[PDB]
Write a protein that binds this ligand. Structure first.
Ligand SMILES: [Cl-]
Ligand SMILES: [Cl-]
Ligand SMILES: [Cl-]
Ligand SMILES: [Cl-]
Ligand SMILES: [Cl-]
Ligand SMILES: [Cl-]
Ligand SMILES: [Cl-]
Ligand SMILES: [Cl-]
Ligand SMILES: [Cl-]
Ligand SMILES: [Cl-]
Ligand code: NA
Ligand code: NA
Ligand code: NA
Ligand code: NA
Lengths: 1345, 665
């Protein structure tokens, strides 16, 4: 920079005056002072990093290398339940044995190759798969602990109990757990360790599987466990489980891979004080489990019409399954929401039962736990809008119930911790422990085999699992011989489908067969075949695996039926009561033709089965029954059956049908390839590393590894991936969902990628061919997903400029069909990397903006316009070649900078269209949204994409609504959005008497106010699609509606609350003379201009006592309580401010002041005419005039003064290159229209007239009061009429009235100013939106030739 | 009798069946007729219909009166209402616990509910809780049994001599039994809140959502997103719940003025205090002695039990408690303080040169609105009201306060005599002066001032320590603070410290008002939780300990390991170990500080050492636009790191060094 006298110097942003004064007091910094500050910072931070390595991390030489050092640093951050020591003998120590890594080649390597021979896959690809399975890490980060160590760990963490003592005593004696102790199992502890053992850092990342005697009995691993009990070695971790500080691992295996018969371990003594139970994962047995959101759509990836997927009595091709699966899942949804419909009494039109709604809300608030004030408000059946404290929570509850019913579909299964099959699948002597259901043998991977008829199927993988369901249904199952259990349970009931979230590919899903039931005391433990880590890309400290299990049909004993009949006749349960409690009514709808009114025996049998002999039932009949009568072991467990006709099937039957469909997909010949390919997808990684370099090899030149700048950049490099993993998962799962449909741009071609009829088409199978290689789109998106999820292990994805600025364009290019190499060379282009870095640097708070409003893209194009002496106007968007891009990276190419910038901006805008389509493809997870505002935005996005498609807009997105309805057949997502978005919209529209904020007038109001807003870069916001403006809208509309409430109608708000404050403090003083205080007043903290409570968290008892004290004040000093409540509304407007006390205002006060009649009259007044809301808009903009989107801030530089009056009072904004940002659109007569409200500096203006191509603005009044010293945001609203602010200064009022004099004197048409009321935007969308309903918009399918 | 009659059949023998219903449900003979006459008002006739003249069909009882409709809810709550013409609900505004009529009704029912809860706890849960869950016991039988037990001796005293007061007590116990189901509901809520409820469905839902979004492991929900009270087992929760309030006068547990049964202290306040004092205690290998965390904890309690006697029985309980429950208590409070650093940046422009200059200020938000500092601000605003009306310093009344304090100093100089030795003598000579100080503090803005606190304020927070000889200590503080007030007044009158810009109570905090705020906070319960609010989320200021926090607590409470760290090969070059331990060396090898200086320096250097977590960076007055560790730009974080590192260059400033970057955490 340069000072006033012309001398040069430096200005250094983000350095505070207090520190800068310690260098030079002068305003300008010299080069020497910059050297001083930077040297101080660098050297002190380097020394601090070294000190941290000396005191906390330990000597970095103990780490694998310097690169892995930063990856292991997080060990020093680890938190967890540290354990109590110092009470007997040697508490603080425990011995650990470090063991060799168990890295085998796959035992079934020949079979995998012979199966791949049928896969229709590339030769080098098959070679890659085979050589990847030649090196399997069987025990990655796996550890085993003795039951003594498990008991010690649980007792010292306070978790111990007498029932842990019982289950431990039973564990040592190999006794089977009863039904009560199942939740107390010894599942592997999810602990972590980091300490300094004799000044060597020891880091233990591991899962602590408990070596139960029942597990190790009859297997090789027993020997290991034996030694640990003999040598008092508590824990045993593989070398990969001890990241640093491991001693030389001791060998426990033979030459042939078998483990040693007698083992003696070299112990390593550690400190218990450094151990901590990191995750206290609960024990959740086989239960209803939410089906993974990703698997149910990634299953379509392997569907091909060249295969025949066969289930019992049904056969489908690739397409058929697509429909079939969708149909089935749709059915489930339709079932579930139907139940919710019965809960609400949904009429044919859509009107619901008020009583039932409030009953549901009360039950949910009771189960969750609520303050008595709010629950009584609900019990009084008050209108939802009359309960200011809980209106948002009640809307949330309704939305949550709808979404959970329609979307959160469940099957049978659970979440399981993986355990390595190290010495468990290889057996010795006779196994009394693991209940084997087949002949004991090795655990085998999925391979291709032939059935009796000669067709090639996939032999499912083999699994061990604690099947608590079987254990409770068949007690003493461990006692039974193998043959009786094998025949007892249906072989199709010992199968499962195991997926891992995130599903990075079809490899994450496995079809598995249960060969043995693990001891119940291993909790949620799953032992899979020896190759599953290589296939799924999974360690053994990764989160719980998810599996989906079949539902069981059980044949209960005749004695159970006899005892149940004796109990039900003895306890005098009437025949009707049974029928009454069984609301399922499976026979009443269709099977009463023969049943009629006569059949009682059927209902008695069904009630017995479903509520007395059913182990899991809330009816409590089963518990009282098992109090004295004891149920018997089921005769047979079978795969519960489904019907081809989905309406015949209930929930469990549909679940099993989906299970069998997924089984047919995952056990088919043609899918084996997609199943067996390891999860690493290397093309993008290898190309990034060849074109930009391998950063896994780093050296510490100039003391780099302790430099603050290097560590900051490394932190951002690592943190990049948490953002990209989610978007990449969504993109993969959407591409797999929408492969059949051919979404495309209306009349846009990117220049690269697949094209149909001159339009860029999305989601084809393969990519373009480039240099002899072409890669499936599935594989490229999976590669990006794997990069993001393993970013910590190797951070290469950020090196290719793949970040949040380029993610959308990268994935659009991927799905379009562009070759991965071209995408890597384009996104990694140096000038785009400069653009990204400058986008991040530009929006920062430290660096002030030279020209606010100049986008980062504009700064970059101006830089390269000046450097290249070319104009971006004369630059074109070109589809380049690899040699141009690849060369430009290595050696600069001249003339392509502005062209790649233009191409990237076009690509970015079209990626906006693609992501707009993706955001409307997430109804199977998000549903209709958590809030009413989210429903509004979803509906408006649907409408906007629809009117863009219909108007045949240039860069529009086509065929999108085929995701909801295609081929004349409703889809999964289509049903989902039908009974979530459309369901909740129907409820809101057809129940205006309840949901006022959801009524059509309020939605239409927000759409209008949004349309009257201008988005930057010259757009009209149109329908409400921005989230912040919607939040402001609803928060202020509640205030506007409530402002008509009779007690709240007080003039001069500020004065009123002041008086209240006065009264308040007086009370406090006087209370001192009575020595018996009021709890509500005691918790009030008065500020300069407000009063309330601190926003710190508060237990339910504390809220209830506050409410009770407020009610006591309502009786003792009613006028003061009334004043305080009115002030509570005036100060905050029931908004969730930092001193809000709205949830403690007794409902008696609203009911007493007749809030019911007020809300009901408001409902019935808005039902017929929305005129009353007309006057809200301006007040809105006049209260929150600080918003840069409600009142855009126009630079004073482009402002032009006008004759006669100063620039501040009235000015004129001319239409210009610099003001194109503000034109909303074109009128009917092609005239341009400008925004209604605009602020300049700190003054607000409303548009009054247009002269030629310019609009005149006059100063107007602001409403509301802002005092941050007191957390005060007063809003001034009047219902049905306009209002004048009580806070505008006197000189400001004089200036405004003089401005009004002047503008009325000379603004007339005689002077050439057309009044602003004429210019209105011409919207074409309105016609389409009037002539089309949301249902027809969503489903389309309108007939054509 | 004297029942209410039908208005529609006025002047006849018939009575109001609706009137009898109203009588039965409000339990007030006058209020029932009051509401009935309210029904006959013209507005009710217009909104509901004319049942007096015409005969309505829908909304009527047998005898022609608007029928009461009773809704029993899922929780057996009874509500009564009318249906008008419109179908609207006319709520009757029935109240629960009608029989109890205290104007301060809240603490009355709270006393009764707490005593019933203590009865049931001492009977059943005194041994263990996790097996009964409040279901083996029947609450109703326990209510009735407690009523009978508390009623028997009172009934005997009534039988001895008839007295209406004893009948009043008997009717009070009968009323306690009358609402037995409502007290049952309250105590079921009490006992259910203790045991933590595990929720599998939404837990699995949010786990799957976070795994979709890419949250591997414990990074799903942060440790400070879970509250610290979820770590206290139900046994510990109850054990802390049933502690008695000590009477501020007698120094012994106080009795409820409604039932003369001892009233108990709030659970939230006790949990907060114990977190404040029991946090950051960890196992230590001090001198070959492994520290049982329960002992140190216990010691703390004992120490604290000497100041606030309310904790005397808790200690007692910890003696008569099982070792397993000892471990449960330990893990209930075996946590670490986790304080959040928020960097606020403010940019201003120079006076004349009109160039920009910024300021970075790092505040600790976790212990920001602490009870003491808040009171200071509470003073300041109250000082603005009483002394600065509209921005004008009332120098006349402030000079009056000056005259009062100077006359008090004159009286102290006059009446001081060493023969006075006990607190009784000090009060005998200076009660009027102490009252005048109460008044000058109150006029200065200490509205909440109470005499009891003054006692502690004069006792210099020594309670059982002074014993017989206490006049000196008190007197000292008295004159000291009195003199300081004069100095404060002379600084506030002469405008050395302007009230309009700098807060006077903060300036004289060390000399006067820190001790005063502490003394008058001794008697108030703080039921708040130690939390902060950051970017829409709510975080808790106590989290289950981490390796780094354990290591710093070890450096602070067992510095000897530092010495051993300096003895090892790699840790020999540690500047931080030497600095914390005091053995700072010069350029030749000699210690820069003497032995006496080294011991004192190491203590302060260890006390100032503070672990923290970077919460957010924000521009001044725009906290909604703040950036946490996930959304902050590299430039903003680089600037914050720069200023935090260099802040040690300024005098009376300390540097804040971030750790080595912890991977992708
Ligand atoms: Cl034990
Ligand atoms: Cl809302
Ligand atoms: Cl379901
Ligand atoms: Cl850092
Ligand atoms: Cl606050
Ligand atoms: Cl400047
Ligand atoms: Cl600080
Ligand atoms: Cl200050
Ligand atoms: Cl921590
Ligand atoms: Cl954070
Ligand atoms: Na060593
Ligand atoms: Na060593
Ligand atoms: Na290409
Ligand atoms: Na103004």
């Amino acid at each position: 920079t340069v000072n006033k006298d012309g001398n040069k110097g430096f200005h250094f942003h983000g350095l505070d005056k207090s520190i800068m004064s310690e260098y030079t007091d002068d305003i300008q910094l010299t080069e020497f002072d910059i050297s001083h500050v930077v040297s101080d910072f660098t050297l002190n931070s380097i020394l601090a990093s070294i000190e941290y390595t000396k005191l906390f991390t330990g000597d970095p030489a103990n780490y694998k290398n310097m690169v892995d050092f930063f990856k292991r640093v997080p060990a020093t951050y680890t938190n967890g339940t540290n354990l109590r020591l110092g009470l007997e003998a040697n508490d603080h120590l425990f011995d650990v044995a470090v063991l060799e890594n168990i890295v085998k080649p796959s035992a079934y390597l020949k079979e995998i190759g012979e199966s791949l021979k049928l896969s229709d896959l590339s030769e080098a690809e098959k070679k890659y798969i085979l050589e990847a399975y030649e090196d399997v890490n069987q025990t990655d980060a796996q550890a085993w602990i003795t039951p003594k160590r498990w008991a010690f760990l649980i007792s010292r963490t306070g978790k111990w109990n007498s029932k842990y003592q019982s289950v431990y005593n039973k564990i040592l004696k190999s006794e089977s757990l009863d039904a009560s102790e199942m939740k107390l199992a010894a599942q592997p502890l999810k602990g972590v360790y980091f300490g300094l053992v004799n000044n060597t850092p020891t880091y233990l990342k591991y899962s602590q599987a408990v070596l139960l005697p029942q597990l190790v009995a009859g297997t090789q691993l027993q020997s290991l466990a034996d030694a640990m009990n003999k040598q008092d070695i508590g824990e045993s971790i593989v070398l990969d489980g001890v990241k640093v500080g491991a001693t030389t691992p001791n060998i426990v295996t033979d030459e042939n891979g078998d483990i040693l018969k007698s083992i003696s371990l070299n112990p390593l003594t550690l400190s218990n004080a450094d151990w901590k139970l990191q995750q206290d994962l609960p024990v959740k047995t086989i239960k209803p489990t939410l089906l993974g959101s990703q698997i149910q759509k990634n299953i379509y990836s392997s569907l091909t019409d060249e295969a025949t997927y066969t289930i019992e009595n049904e056969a489908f091709n690739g397409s058929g399954m697509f429909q079939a699966i969708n149909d089935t899942v749709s059915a489930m949804s339709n079932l579930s929401i139907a139940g919710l419909s019965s809960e609400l009494g949904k009429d044919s039109e859509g009107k619901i039962d008020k009583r039932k709604l409030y009953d549901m809300l009360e039950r949910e608030m009771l189960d969750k736990g609520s303050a008595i004030n709010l629950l009584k408000s609900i019990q009084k059946n008050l209108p939802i809008e009359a309960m200011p404290g809980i209106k948002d929570k009640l809307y949330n509850i309704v939305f949550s119930k709808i979404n959970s019913a329609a979307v959160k579909l469940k099957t049978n299964g659970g979440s399981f911790i993986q355990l390595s099959n190290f010495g468990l699948d290889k057996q010795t002597a006779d196994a009394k422990g693991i209940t084997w259901l087949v002949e004991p043998s090795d655990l085998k991977p999925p391979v291709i085999e032939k059935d009796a008829d000669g067709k090639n199927y996939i032999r499912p993988g083999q699994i061990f699992m604690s099947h608590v369901q079987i254990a409770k249904l068949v007690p003493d199952y461990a006692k039974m011989d193998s043959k009786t259990l094998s025949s007892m349970i249906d072989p199709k009931a010992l199968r499962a489908i195991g997926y891992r979230i995130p599903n990075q590919g079809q490899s994450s899903n496995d079809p598995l067969q249960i060969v043995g039931i693990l001891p119940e005391a291993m909790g949620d433990t799953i032992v899979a075949y020896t190759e599953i880590p290589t296939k799924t890309g999974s360690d053994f400290d990764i989160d719980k695996m998810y599996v989906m299990l079949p539902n069981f049909k059980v044949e209960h004993t005749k004695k159970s039926f006899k005892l149940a009949k004796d109990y039900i006749a003895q306890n005098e349960i009437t025949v009707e009561e049974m029928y009454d409690e069984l609301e399922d009514h499976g026979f009443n709808i269709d099977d009463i033709a023969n049943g009629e009114e006569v059949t009682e025996s059927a209902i008695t049998e069904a009630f017995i089965k479903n509520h007395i002999l059913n182990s899991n039932s809330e009816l409590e009949y089963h518990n009282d029954f098992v109090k004295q009568h004891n149920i018997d072991a089921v005769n047979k467990i079978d795969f519960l059956g489904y019907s081809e006709e989905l309406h015949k099937n209930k929930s469990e039957q549909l679940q099993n049908r989906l299970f069998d469909l997924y089984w047919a997909v995952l056990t088919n010949e043609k899918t084996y390839g997609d199943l067996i390919t390891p999860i690493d997808f290397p093309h993008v990684k290898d190309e990034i590393k060849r074109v930009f370099g391998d950063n896994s090899k780093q050296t510490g030149e100039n003391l780099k590894f302790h430099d603050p700048l290097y560590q900051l950049k490394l932190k951002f490099t690592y943190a990049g991936g948490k953002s990209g993993v989610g978007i990449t998962a969504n993109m993969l799962v959407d591409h797999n969902r929408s492969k059949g449909i051919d979404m495309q741009f209306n009349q846009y071609n990117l220049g690269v990628g697949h094209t149909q009829n001159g339009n860029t088409v999305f989601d084809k199978e393969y990519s373009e061919e480039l240099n002899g290689t072409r890669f499936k789109i599935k594989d490229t998106i999976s590669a990006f997903l794997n990069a993001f999820v393993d970013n910590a292990k190797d951070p290469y994805i950020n090196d290719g400029n793949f970040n949040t600025y380029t993610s959308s364009v990268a994935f659009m290019l991927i799905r379009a069909g562009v070759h991965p190499d071209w995408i890597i060379s384009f996104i990694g282009q140096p000038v785009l990397r400069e653009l990204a870095d400058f986008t991040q640097r530009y929006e920062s708070k430290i660096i002030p903006k030279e020209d606010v409003g100049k986008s980062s893209f504009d700064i970059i194009v101006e830089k390269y316009e000046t450097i290249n002496q070319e104009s971006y106007k004369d630059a074109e968007s070109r589809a380049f070649s690899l040699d141009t891009l690849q060369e430009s990276i290595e050696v600069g190419v001249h003339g392509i900078d502005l062209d790649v910038l233009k191409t990237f901006k076009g690509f970015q805008e079209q990626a906006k269209r693609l992501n707009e389509s993706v955001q409307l493809s997430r109804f199977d997870t998000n549903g209709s949204g958590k809030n009413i505002l989210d429903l509004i935005i979803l509906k408006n996005k649907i409408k906007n994409l629809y009117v863009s498609e219909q108007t045949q807009q240039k860069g529009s997105m086509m065929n999108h609504f085929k995701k909801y309805h295609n081929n004349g057949k409703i889809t999964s997502l289509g049903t989902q959005v039908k009974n979530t978005l459309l369901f909740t919209d129907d409820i809101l529209n057809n129940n205006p008497s309840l949901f006022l904020l959801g009524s059509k007038p309020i939605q239409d109001l927000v759409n209008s106010i949004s349309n009257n807003l201008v988005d930057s870069r010259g757009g009209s916001r149109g329908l409400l699609t921005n989230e912040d403006v919607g939040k402001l809208f609803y928060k202020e509309v509640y205030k506007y509606i409530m402002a008509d409430f009779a007690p709240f109608k007080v003039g001069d708000p500020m004065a009123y609350i002041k008086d209240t404050i006065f009264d308040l403090v007086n009370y406090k003083t006087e209370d001192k003379q009575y020595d018996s205080s009021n709890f509500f007043i005691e918790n009030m903290t008065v500020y300069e201009n407000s009063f309330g409570i601190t926003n710190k968290n508060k237990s339910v008892d504390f809220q209830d006592r506050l409410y009770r004290s407020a009610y006591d004040l309502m009786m003792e000093n009613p006028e003061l309580a009334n004043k305080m409540f009115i002030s509570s509304f005036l100060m905050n407007g029931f908004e969730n401010k930092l001193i809000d006390i709205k949830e403690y205002i007794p409902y008696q006060w609203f009911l007493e002041n007749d809030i019911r009649s007020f809300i009901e009259s408001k409902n019935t007044g808005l039902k017929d005419s929305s005129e009353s809301l007309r006057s809200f808009e301006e007040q809105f903009i006049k209260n929150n005039s600080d918003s840069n989107i409600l009142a855009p801030k126009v630079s004073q530089s482009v402002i032009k003064s006008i004759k006669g009056i100063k620039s501040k009072h009235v000015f004129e904004l001319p239409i210009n290159d610099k003001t194109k940002r503000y034109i909303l659109g074109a009128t009917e007569t092609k005239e341009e229209v400008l925004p209604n409200y605009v602020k300049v500096g700190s003054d607000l203006y409303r548009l009054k007239a247009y002269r030629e191509k310019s609009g005149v603005y006059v100063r107007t009044n602001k409403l509301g009061f802002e005092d941050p010293k007191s957390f005060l945001s007063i809003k001034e609203y009047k219902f049905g009429t306009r209002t004048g602010g009580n806070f505008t200064g006197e000189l400001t009022k004089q200036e405004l009235v003089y401005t009004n004099q002047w503008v009325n004197e000379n603004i007339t048409l005689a002077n050439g100013y057309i009044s602003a009321d004429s210019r209105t935007v011409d919207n074409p969308a309105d016609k389409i939106l009037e002539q089309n309903s949301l249902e027809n918009i969503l489903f389309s399918q309108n007939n054509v030739v | 009798a004297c029942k209410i009659e039908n208005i529609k059949y006025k002047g006849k023998e018939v009575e109001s069946k609706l009137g009898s219903q109203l009588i039965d449900i409000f339990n007030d003979l006058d209020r029932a007729k009051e509401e009935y006459d309210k029904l006959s008002s013209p507005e009710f006739i217009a909104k509901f219909g004319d049942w007096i003249n015409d005969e309505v069909e829908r909304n009527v009882n047998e005898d022609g009166e608007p029928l009461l409709i009773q809704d029993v809810r899922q929780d057996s709550s009874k509500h009564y209402f009318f249906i008008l013409k419109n179908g609207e609900r006319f709520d009757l505004l029935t109240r629960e616990f009608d029989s109890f009529t205290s104007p301060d009704l809240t603490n009355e029912i709270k006393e009764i509910t707490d005593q019933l809860s203590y009865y049931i706890y001492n009977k059943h849960f005194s041994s263990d809780f996790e097996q009964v869950e409040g279901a083996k016991l029947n609450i109703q039988n326990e209510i009735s049994q407690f009523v009978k037990e508390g009623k028997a001796p009172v009934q005997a005293a009534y039988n001895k001599l008839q007295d209406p007061d004893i009948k009043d007590l008997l009717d009070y116990y009968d009323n306690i039994e009358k609402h037995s189901d409502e007290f049952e509901s309250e105590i079921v809520k009490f006992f259910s809140e203790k045991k933590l409820i595990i929720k599998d469905a939404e837990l699995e839902d949010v786990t799957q959502e976070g795994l979709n979004e890419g949250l591997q492991g414990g990074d799903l929900v942060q440790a400070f997103e879970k509250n610290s009270k979820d770590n206290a087992t139900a046994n510990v929760k109850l054990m802390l719940s049933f502690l008695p309030k000590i009477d501020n006068l007698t120094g012994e547990p106080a009795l409820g003025d409604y039932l003369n049964k001892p009233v108990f202290r709030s659970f939230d306040s006790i949990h907060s205090e114990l977190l404040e004092v029991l946090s950051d205690i960890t196992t230590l290998h001090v001198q070959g002695e492994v520290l049982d965390v329960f002992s140190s904890m216990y010691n703390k309690i004992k120490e604290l039990a000497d100041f606030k006697k309310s904790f005397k029985p808790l200690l007692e309980i910890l003696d008569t408690i099982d070792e397993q429950k000892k471990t449960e208590f330990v893990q209930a409070f075996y946590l670490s303080k986790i304080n959040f650093y928020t960097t606020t940046i403010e940019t201003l422009e120079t006076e004349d040169q009109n160039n920009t200059l910024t300021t970075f200020k790092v505040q600790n938000v976790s212990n920001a609105n602490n009870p003491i500092s808040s009171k200071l601000t509470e003073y300041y605003t109250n000082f603005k009201y009483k002394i600065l009306p509209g921005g004008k310093l009332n120098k006349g009344k402030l000079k009056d306060l000056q005259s009062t304090v100077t006359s008090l100093l004159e009286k102290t100089r006059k009446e001081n005599n060493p023969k006075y030795k006990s607190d009784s003598d000090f009060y005998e000579v200076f009660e009027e002066g102490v009252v005048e100080l109460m008044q000058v503090f109150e006029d200065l803005g200490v509205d909440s001032i109470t005499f009891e606190a003054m006692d502690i304020f004069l006792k210099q927070f020594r309670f059982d320590l002074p014993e017989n000889n206490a006049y000196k200590i008190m007197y000292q503080q008295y004159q000291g603070k009195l003199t300081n007030l004069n100095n404060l007044l002379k600084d506030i009158q002469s405008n050395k410290i302007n009230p309009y810009k700098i807060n006077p109570f903060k300036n004289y905090s060390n000399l006067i008002f820190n001790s005063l705020a502490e003394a008058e906070n001794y008697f108030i319960e703080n039921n708040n939780e130690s939390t902060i609010f950051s970017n829409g989320k709510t975080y808790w200021n106590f989290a289950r300990p981490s390796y780094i926090s354990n290591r710093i607590n070890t450096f602070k409470n067992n510095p000897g390991v530092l010495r051993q760290l300096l003895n090892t090969s790699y840790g020999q070059s540690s500047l931080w170990a030497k600095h914390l331990l005091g053995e700072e060396k010069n350029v030749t090898g000699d210690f820069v500080l003497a032995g006496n200086a080294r011991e004192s320096a190491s203590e302060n250097r260890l006390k100032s050492l503070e672990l923290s977590i970077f919460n957010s960076l924000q521009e001044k007055d725009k906290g909604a636009e703040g950036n946490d560790n996930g959304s902050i730009s590299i430039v903003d974080q680089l600037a914050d790191k720069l200023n935090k590192v260099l802040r040690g260059g300024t005098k009376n400033g300390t540097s804040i060094y971030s750790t080595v970057t912890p991977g992708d955490k």
